[PDB]
Amino acid sequence: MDDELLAVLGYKVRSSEMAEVALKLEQLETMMSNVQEDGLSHLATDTVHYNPSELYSWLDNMLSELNSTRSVILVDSQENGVRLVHALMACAEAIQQNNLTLAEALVKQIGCLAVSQAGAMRKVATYFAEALARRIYRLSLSDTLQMHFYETCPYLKFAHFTANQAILEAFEGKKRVHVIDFSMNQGLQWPALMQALALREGGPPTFRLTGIGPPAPDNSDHLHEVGCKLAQLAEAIHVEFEYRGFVANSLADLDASMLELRPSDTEAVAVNSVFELHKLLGRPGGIEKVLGVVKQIKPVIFTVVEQESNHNGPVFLDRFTESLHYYSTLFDSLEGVPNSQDKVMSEVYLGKQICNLVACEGPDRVERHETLSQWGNRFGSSGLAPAHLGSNAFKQASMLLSVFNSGQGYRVEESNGCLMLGWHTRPLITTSAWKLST
């Protein structure tokens, strides 16, 4: 049992550990009175802090080292935006009530209204209208797009940086390591981690890499090219490198037997996933199998980056309105970027995401996003435990944002040991790390 009055304020203190905590605070003050500014500067510069909510462990660390939520943000619009939202929700309700005759007129009216608008609302309404038309008429290349999205938006860089920092912390004091990536893609994440490993105190370890990718319709061998390109830089900085890749149509088709694993006492293993787990929610029993495989691997760290939004509800209208909120926020944030080809390609990418979210159903729908609470419930049911992130990762992410965006209002937040990236006060994506439960 915690302290309810303190729990409301954001601090987790057991009722029976009150006086003890108080005592620790006493011992801190006296300490800070006899150490002056050397210890204060050490605590402000060299110390790494974890989980500020739990005061007991935080105070212990300082003493040792000194010795359904709906988040909406409104931007100024005009009457045309109000009418556009009215018409969009009216069309969604008409579809839900199985009208299918008012829906066509409503979608044409939506297009007519969106013709005379300006800003992100124009593009949002256009994409949602195409999605609605596709849905009602059903009722009755990617690599370049992802490269442009990486160039224009800060989410992929944030994910890679936070995951790499967590992996580097988990791989400290090791001589043989292995990385299993569920989101291999073009291999844009690994060179920085490899450089950091090569620039370590005590000696870099030996590196093994596993990359899993979807089956391409043309069956191109992009994984081999990525692996050889990685191996060049690997041998550049004197790191022993081994690479290996697979093609699989779903992460639920994987097993630890085909991963060619070595003894845990011999090789450490880290599992990575960036925007890939939510695609397993279409399959009725896919996430459990993948989490069981992850548990069988017995890694030292499991890094997950996801989108923070409830887009997997049982009612179509609620999903529609939640996704409308989320993507309106996304396009409002994207407003500030200067015009370029990469920007329009990112817009096309987001429009494809919206179309899949609204139109498709069943296993064909893969954009089934969730929130941190639901993901945490799933992970805890799978038998995992949180691995809290520190202040150094927070500082690195903040400095990355302050360099690559500068003017745009992106913010970093810490919650429950996880890191959140958002626009102003509205969170957008979340990075977390997990380990085996004791």
């Binding site: 500020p52 988040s71 909406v72």
Partner: protein, 334 residues
């Protein structure tokens, strides 16, 4: 051990934790550690679903300066479905509806509008005064020194006054009260001055432990130094971090009744409610501010709690909190 006998244990823990963290975050050369400060700060998100009869949402008031505010409203009795867009800014139903523009404390350098200690306070204000609350997110020192916060408050005041769905049905006007905590009281006083200078009409001021100072050392500063969570050293550091370069504490932004300050005699000023804690080391400056308001010919009610410390309103476990809430409710619903 002296401060241990005047507060409950959990309140003591909260204030001591804030004290030690802020001790860590300050550098001798007038430099702040913003990254660690933001990492340590506890925060909460806006929720459009009514919880305990209150729901909130955020509005981007200004884009050039990234000025933002949060709005707290009572839950709809007629509409059982939780509010959404097209329903967050629905017109108010009531002959008289007061609206409070609130400024948070932090000695011009800490905290935000989404901090978990001020979100609870705003929700309690909504629940106890039956009003609408707008909380501003103003720029902080030393990265954004004087006068950024005053300009932010002015812009927020204009935005609140220009809203058509906040107008009352008795005179087609917005009933506005300015409220402040710590440095928020300083901001509220200055914004009230500017509003009186312009054509905007403010109905009342609420100042909970306002932040004021001066060059001289008062008796309470010399007698209560370091005994009740606050020391003269950090007060000097914060005043140096806020004020312009090469400026002393007789600046009008520090001492409202300095010789360089402006006379309040014969000036359109709202009625004030100033609350002063007895166990605060800058209580003398607050009492002097109340006396100066009274001498200038303005209406002011003074609440002196003789055995209260800083942050008595952050937890509802003391009589001071209940009494101050009662007086605030009577003040705004007069």
């Amino acid at each position: 051990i002296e401060s241990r006998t005047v507060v409950p244990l959990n309140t003591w823990v909260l204030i001591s934790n804030f004290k030690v963290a802020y001790n860590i975050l300050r550098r001798p050369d007038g430099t702040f550690n913003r990254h660690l400060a933001e990492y340590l700060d506890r925060k909460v998100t806006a929720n459009a679903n009514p919880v305990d009869g209150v729901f909130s949402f955020d509005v981007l008031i200004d884009r050039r300066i990234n000025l933002l505010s949060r709005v707290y409203r009572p839950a709809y009795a007629d509409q059982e479905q939780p509010p959404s867009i097209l329903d967050l800014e629905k017109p108010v139903d009531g002959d008289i509806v007061p609206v409070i523009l609130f400024f948070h404390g932090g000695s011009f350098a800490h905290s935000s509008a989404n901090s978990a200690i001020y979100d609870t306070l705003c929700r309690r204000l909504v629940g106890l005064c039956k009003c609408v609350v707008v909380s501003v997110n103003y720029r902080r020192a030393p990265e954004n020194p004087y006068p950024c916060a005053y300009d932010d408050g002015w812009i927020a005041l204009n935005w609140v006054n220009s809203r058509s769905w906040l107008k009352s049905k008795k005179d087609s006007k917005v009933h506005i009260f300015l409220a402040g905590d710590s440095s928020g009281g300083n901001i509220a006083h200055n914004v009230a001055l500017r509003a009186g200078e312009s054509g905007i009409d403010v109905l009342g001021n609420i100042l909970l432990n306002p932040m004021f100072g001066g060059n001289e050392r008062t008796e309470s500063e010399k007698s209560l130094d370091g005994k009740y969570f606050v020391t003269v050293r950090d007060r000097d550091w914060y005043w140096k971090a806020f004020l312009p370069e090469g400026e002393d504490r007789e600046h009008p932004a520090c001492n409202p009744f300095s010789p360089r300050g402006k006379s309040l005699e014969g000036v359109s000023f709202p009625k004030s409610l100033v609350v002063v804690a007895g166990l605060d080391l800058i209580r003398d400056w607050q009492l002097a501010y109340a006396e100066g308001l009274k001498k200038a010919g303005q209406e002011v009610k003074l609440m002196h709690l003789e055995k209260a410390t800083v942050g008595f309103y952050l937890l509802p476990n003391n009589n001071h909190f209940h009494n101050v809430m009662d007086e605030i409710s009577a003040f705004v619903n007069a």
